[PDB]
Design a protein around this ligand. Structure first.
Ligand SMILES: C/C=C/C(=O)NCCCC[C@@H](N)C(=O)OP(=O)(O)OC[C@H]1O[C@@H](n2cnc3c(N)ncnc32)[C@H](O)[C@@H]1O
Ligand SMILES: [Mg+2]
Length: 259
């Protein structure tokens, strides 16, 4: 008896990349299932006995160390933000991204991006800190939305404002960062550059200034980029589905919790 599509879906939940196992081998479902459950339980037991770190938390800590060591100030800003910030980002009620916003009250929303809060920090810190101003944030962002898109994800955004805000310097920070993480990439590109892993977008990056700056009281050169942490994990651990890298009750470090 061939496996049913339902059975195949069930085994794929339990399959980790590099199991080196085939599902067209003439072994019954119940036995293939039992083998995989066994391995996945062992994977959790090993994490529990040895490291005990969540991949998303650990990646955040590794990224944080990278940027702190390179001169960037760690920011932790509100996740719940004024709706007015979305309009001031130039996102009108007719825009597709406007339909993607999770509204909370009359006046607030879950941030879909880190830029508005970072804009405010750039303007404020420019009164206190020497040139250039270098900051970053890592945290939750939200968009109503795929095997590449989550509704609840985690962004890194870094930026620099003042001197040294060139395309060359932006590409160099991106290059050092991803070679540090061990992630293969290419950069394709007032500029806008995309950092790609094959067909998967890891980042959009920007060389300012841009006209939007003035709405935020910013009038200096700047560079920046945003990376999705779940996308980075997906590539690093070779997950077939990005849900394996997300905040979840169904997966822990890419291992099914439904055992
Ligand atoms: C003061 C300015 C600061 C500054 O830093 N400016 C330049 C920042 C670049 C602008 C940039 N930060 C931006 O505007 O969101 P975008 O939709 O482009 O997404 C950026 C990345 O987030 C990830 N990502 C986005 N949506 C996702 C989803 N639904 N699921 C998973 N990952 C996702 C993915 O890795 C994507 O490439
Ligand atoms: Mg983009």
């Amino acid at each position: 008896p061939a496996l049913t599509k339902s059975q195949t879906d069930r085994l794929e939940v339990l399959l980790n990349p590099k199991d080196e196992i085939s599902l067209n081998s003439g072994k019954p479902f119940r036995e293939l299932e039992s083998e995989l459950l066994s391995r996945r339980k062992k994977d959790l037991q090993q994490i529990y006995a040895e490291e005990r770190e969540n991949y998303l938390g650990k990646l955040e800590r590794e990224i944080t160390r990278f940027f702190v060591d390179r001169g960037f100030l760690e920011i932790k800003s509100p996740i719940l933000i004024p709706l007015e910030y979305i309009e001031r980002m130039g996102i009108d009620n007719d825009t597709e991204l406007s339909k993607q916003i999770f509204r909370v009250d009359k006046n607030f929303c879950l941030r879909p991006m880190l830029a508005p809060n970072l804009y405010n920090y750039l303007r404020k810190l420019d009164r206190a800190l020497p040139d250039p101003i270098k900051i970053f944030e890592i945290g939750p962002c939200y968009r109503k939305e795929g095997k590449e898109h989550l509704e609840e994800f985690t962004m890194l955004n870094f930026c620099q404002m003042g001197s040294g805000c060139t395309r060359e310097n932006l590409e160099s920070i991106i290059t050092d960062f991803l070679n540090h993480l061990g992630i293969d990439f290419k950069i394709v590109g007032g500029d806008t550059l995309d950092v790609m892993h094959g067909d998967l977008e890891l980042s959009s990056a920007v060389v300012g200034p841009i006209p939007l700056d003035r709405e935020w009281g910013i009038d200096k050169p700047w560079i920046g980029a945003g990376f999705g942490l779940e996308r980075l994990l997906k590539v690093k651990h070779d997950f077939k589905n990005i849900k394996r890298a997300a905040r979840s009750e169904s997966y822990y470090n890419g291992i099914s919790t439904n055992l």
